[PDB]
């Protein structure tokens, strides 16, 4: 009972378009198992105004990130990098998996985090169709209320970047090589050519816009709609509330609500997959071909391990009774970005501080989303890839939000109080974070929520009595995400600066400054730089250096202060993956290694995170395995004109 | 059962027209399916005081329009700016559509109105036989009874346009290129020239005549019959009460009360559509060629919807089962003309002032139809045709009337008793409205006289914190309904002045002066004009400009007092239509774009409305439609000298 030739687990953001151009483009039997549930009629999901709460109960009001019916509540241990502190991730539960409760921003990840670290046969320009596609499918829209910030900041980062330009350093965070000379800023005209960040040929690495492209349309009516991949790929015209196939899609036959544990094996080929129901009761079903993981980053290595691939050693210390494959390398190598925040506040009169922040509320169109630009590397950055003076990378993701986004005890410390309306948000985050992590399960019976994640983002150096010179490297090595965040605040600063000026220069008489980290720290730090140069993170280890000078032990003394901002005064971002990435545990085909028919298609087999917000890649994944399983290239070669059509129902 | 080669869907005043002279021009088998029925021996549509309520019983004295049984009863929604008020517009049902209840006005529209807004292969000089034919067929008549007040009027308005001439202005609103320094305006002389407004080349756009042609005729008796489409081309002679044809007319099938619903598809191409007899019980007719929609304005977008063509998202919303096609342009951009009333009172001797509006009553040869001009353009009218320099356009129609045509609660609040006999009516509109609509169903099972009907007349703007030369623009796009209706009443002012002095020179010794719109405003704006100039209308923004200046503000608050008369103090002209116009739904041969074998042929397939009263849009479109679908000019060439016989059964 219930066979499928191809079984999918999950629908994903790349579940739903798996199972869509699987069932249209073949004639197998096709069956989906999702734990989730269609949320086609639910307005906290549909409005964009609902990440903010519009629809809670009174006595309920929590985000719906936290409520454990809508996500995963992975709960992680205790930080040693973050002060002993346990935040929670969580991973979308449903239809279109944690596209259901993110904040609608899409970015392809760019040209050269495509070319260099991904293996042979991956590489931009044979994902490049994928990306179109999956761009045209969701079809965005960017940002409509226009501001006056935007503009002066964008002539302010033109001024940095043909100030940069001018200089002649081998590399910086406003120099776009595959540009020219020309600056690769946008224009302040109110006639200026929109800017964009998603260029099909990928010239565009690192380069400053004035919006994004958001997931939310605009109906007849007036009311804005959130785009995600179930209201996208599997709506009403396919499937109906019994979860079977209509027309050329027939053959599908979606199951919700329904959670699977384990994969039957045979010694080295799945026969079946098992799943509970709403009843509370087991059920069995059969594989014929081919089983399908598309879990998300969080949860494909404990289904992967619990059914009896992974280190043997562990898992039989846990209990787990049937033993597939060994290898030591099942859930470890995840990647995460960290966002740090930071609060510039405008002092003058009223009216011109009023009238400075104008466009700026919380719109559907954008959801506070008006940005800046992809920053990339800092000129003293010491962690850079040796092939740096050949392509530009990017690192850094600039966006402008309104209001002071910060933890409540930070915000009553600082006293950066809601209530103040001269003051606005920036945020500079790093995309290619270096601290990694590892999952480990604790009971091979059901998945649970919580397995052991340990990460530990900002961790200290500890000198030892040996010669400087010998451990410096291993320092180096060790203190990367600290080094990246002061960057980004020096990095801040310095548009900060340009702000005043221009803005000055405007004809607003009025000045920006820092106010949030303790303007002194920033200006003592920028200060530093600027007398030490490439060797300012010598003074992060006071002993080891030993330069016992006033200047000098001040500068270690403002260095081990300024470290709690990075640690403390910002959230951690979602956008974990890359748990399984090719070659660790799965090879090119995205097939697991000494097994015969388990494929695992989603963002968690991705070899490393790409060059920005990871909404795309998982779809991309998927659409790749389509005709990686298929065996011909058909959805790629589909005209560009070809989109699902959209059913609000 | 009941197959046809073409299928026409309604009889309106295009349904009779395409009826006729399609069976007689062709030898296929031709049905027809009407919603009403024939009125020939109806006292109330045929004695033209029937439109005054002659005939009405005396516990429904109701108007025509009102009268559900004549009419569909299209009520509409709340109207945001006209003061949240649901007013209700008719569609005339029964042959000849709209006709059997109308004022029996004919114009043709003019030269520019086509040359310019239309596209190519529309123009005049494609659509002149066509309206000479159409004109020929209904052969109209002009006014018998001739008055003394309108000589006074054409000298006045021959004064003010040789003023005007040589004033040497670019455009105004007594300005008539194509005839040259002699001012266009009829001769007060007893022997006169009778001046015509629908001259076959087309060379009257603006100017003042004496009377217009109503579709009324003389018969022998001496009764006045009213002349409209039922009972020019489907009269006895032709079709039986059997609904068949005779003669050569043989191949004619007509059912009357007979609404279709649906359309039925072969996923590109008609093959039959069902209706309901007046038992309550469905039936269904087969289509062999073509099916042919002459529904009308507001009913053509609903029963293109509903049968599956339209916006995919909106119609699977509604719940629209079958889904043929997706255009977001179905029933979009209609428009509908609006007509501001003023009321003129003469203050002197009882016996001068009875002498004075002599030949003024209710009759039906004129209806009350005096009328003086179609008038044009404004001097300070902001929004104008970039080439207005070039060609002259058409924007008003001035046409004077008896009593006091107002409603009732205004009647009382001013004071203007019919009861008093020292005052009459003139009514300047506007025939290029700017205001927009949008039509959408509600229910995809039949058509209803209320579907969702926005219409927003006349539309505030709400200034923002903004410079005010970079929103300007906006603001006088906006706000140009207002602008028009004010350079209405000051053209009235004018024409009002030009009659006092001219009549005091007639030997009547009497004086004419505004009282309904409170003259002191209307005097009060004459000045603001006059001491302003082109930006009069700056201040109806009044902190956007911030004069803050006695003058100022005073002007500012009698620009907001003085526009509640174009709210409130008319009433909306039912000339809806162009919902459908050409290139948005259908093409240039009235074809519907992606479908195969559906045509529609009404007012609705209209790409811009007419520059004047649009009776003869709808049939001049069916005419050409005839030689359209047939493929020969067979139509545009018979000679002149060619009417249908007029019989009155
Ligand atoms: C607050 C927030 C904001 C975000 N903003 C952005 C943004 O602006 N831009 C961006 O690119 N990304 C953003 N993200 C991240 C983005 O939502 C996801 O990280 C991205 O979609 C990649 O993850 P995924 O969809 O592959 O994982 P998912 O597909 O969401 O992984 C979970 C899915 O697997 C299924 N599943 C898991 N285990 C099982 C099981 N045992 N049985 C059955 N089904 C199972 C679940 O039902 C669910 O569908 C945001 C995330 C959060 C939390
Ligand atoms: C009070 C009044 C005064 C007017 N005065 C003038 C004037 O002086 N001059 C002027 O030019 N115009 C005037 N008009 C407007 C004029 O009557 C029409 O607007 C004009 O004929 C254009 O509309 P139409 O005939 O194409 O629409 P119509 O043909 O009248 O549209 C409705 C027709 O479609 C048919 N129909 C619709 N839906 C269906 C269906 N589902 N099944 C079957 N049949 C269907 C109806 O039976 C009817 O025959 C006036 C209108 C009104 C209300």
């Given at each position: 009972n219930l066979t499928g030739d191809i079984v999918i687990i999950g629908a994903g953001a790349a579940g739903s378009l798996l199972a869509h151009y699987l069932a249209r483009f073949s004639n197998m039997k096709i069956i989906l198992l999702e734990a989730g549930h269609s949320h086609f009629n639910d307005p906290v999901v549909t409005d964009p105004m609902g990440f903010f709460?519009?629809?809670?109960?009174p006595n309920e009001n929590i985000s719906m990130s936290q409520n454990p019916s809508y996500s995963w509540q992975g709960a992680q241990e205790p930080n040693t990098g973050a002060y002993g502190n346990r935040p929670i991730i969580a991973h979308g539960m449903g239809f279109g998996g944690s596209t259901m409760?993110?904040?609608?921003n899409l970015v392809v990840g760019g040209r050269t985090v495509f070319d260099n670290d991904w293996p042979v046969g991956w590489k931009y320009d044979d994902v490049k169709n994928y990306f179109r596609r999956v761009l045209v499918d969701i079809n965005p829209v960017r940002d409509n209320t226009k501001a006056s910030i935007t503009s002066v900041a964008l002539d302010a980062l033109r001024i940095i970047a043909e100030q940069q330009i001018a200089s002649g350093?081998?590399?910086?965070?406003?120099?776009?090589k595959a540009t020219?000379?020309?600056?690769?800023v946008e224009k302040?005209?109110?006639?200026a050519v929109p800017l964009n960040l998603n260029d099909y040929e990928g010239v565009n690495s690192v380069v400053a816009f004035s919006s994004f492209y958001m997931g939310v349309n605009q109906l007849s009516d007036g009311n804005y709609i959130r785009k995600y991949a179930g209201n996208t790929y599997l709506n009403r015209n396919y499937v109906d509330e019994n979860g079977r196939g209509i027309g050329?899609?027939?053959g599908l036959r979606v199951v919700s609500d329904a959670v699977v544990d384990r994969i039957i094996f045979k010694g080295n080929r799945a026969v079946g997959v098992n799943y509970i129901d709403r009843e509370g009761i087991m059920h069995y079903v059969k594989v014929n071909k081919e089983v399908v993981v598309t879990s998300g980053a969080f949860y494909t290595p404990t289904i992967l391990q619990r059914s009896g691939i992974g280190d043997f050693t562990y898992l039989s210390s846990i209990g787990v009774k049937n033993l597939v494959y060994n290898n030591?390398?099942?859930?470890?190598g995840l990647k995460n970005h960290y966002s740090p925040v930071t609060i510039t506040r405008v002092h003058g009169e009223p009216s011109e501080v009023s009238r400075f922040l104008s466009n700026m509320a919380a719109n559907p169109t954008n959801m506070g989303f008006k940005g800046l630009a992809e920053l990339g590397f800092h000129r003293?950055?010491?962690?850079?890839?040796?092939?740096a003076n050949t392509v530009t990378y990017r690192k850094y993701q600039l966006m402008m939000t309104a209001g002071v986004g910060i933890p409540a005890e930070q915000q009553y410390l600082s006293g950066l109080?809601?209530?103040?309306?001269?003051l606005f948000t920036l945020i500079a985050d790093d995309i290619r974070f270096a601290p990694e992590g590892y999952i480990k399960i604790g009971t091979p019976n059901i998945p649970r929520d919580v397995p052991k994640i340990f990460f530990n983002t900002f961790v200290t150096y500890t000198p030892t009595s040996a010669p400087a010179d010998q451990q410096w490297p291993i320092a180096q090595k060790t203190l990367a995400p600290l080094i990246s965040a002061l960057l980004g605040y020096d990095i801040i600063y310095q548009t900060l600066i340009s702000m005043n000026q221009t803005a000055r220069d405007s004809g607003f008489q009025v000045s920006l400054e820092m106010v949030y980290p303790l303007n002194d720290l920033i200006y003592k730090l920028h200060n530093g730089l600027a007398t030490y140069g490439?060797?300012?993170?010598?003074?992060?280890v006071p002993t080891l250096?030993?330069?016992?000078?006033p200047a000098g032990r001040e500068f270690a003394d403002t260095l081990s202060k300024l470290s709690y901002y990075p640690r403390v005064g910002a959230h951690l971002d979602?956008?974990?993956?890359?748990?399984?990435?090719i070659g660790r545990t799965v090879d090119s085909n995205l097939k697991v290694i000494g097994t015969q028919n388990v494929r695992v298609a989603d963002?968690?087999?991705?070899?490393f995170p790409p060059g920005?917000?990871?909404?795309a890649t998982a779809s991309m994944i998927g659409a790749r395995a389509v005709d990686l399983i298929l065996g011909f290239p058909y959805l790629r070669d589909l005209?560009?004109?070809?989109?699902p059509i959209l059913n609000v129902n």
């Open positions: 709460g519009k629809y809670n109960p409760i993110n904040r609608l350093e081998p590399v910086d965070f406003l120099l776009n020219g000379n020309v600056p690769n302040t005209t109110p006639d050329k899609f027939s030591p390398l099942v859930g470890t003293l950055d010491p962690n850079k890839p040796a092939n109080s809601p209530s103040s309306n001269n490439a060797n300012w993170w010598h003074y992060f250096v030993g330069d016992d000078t979602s956008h974990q993956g890359c748990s399984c990435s963002l968690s087999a991705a070899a920005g917000n990871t909404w005209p560009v004109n070809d989109v």
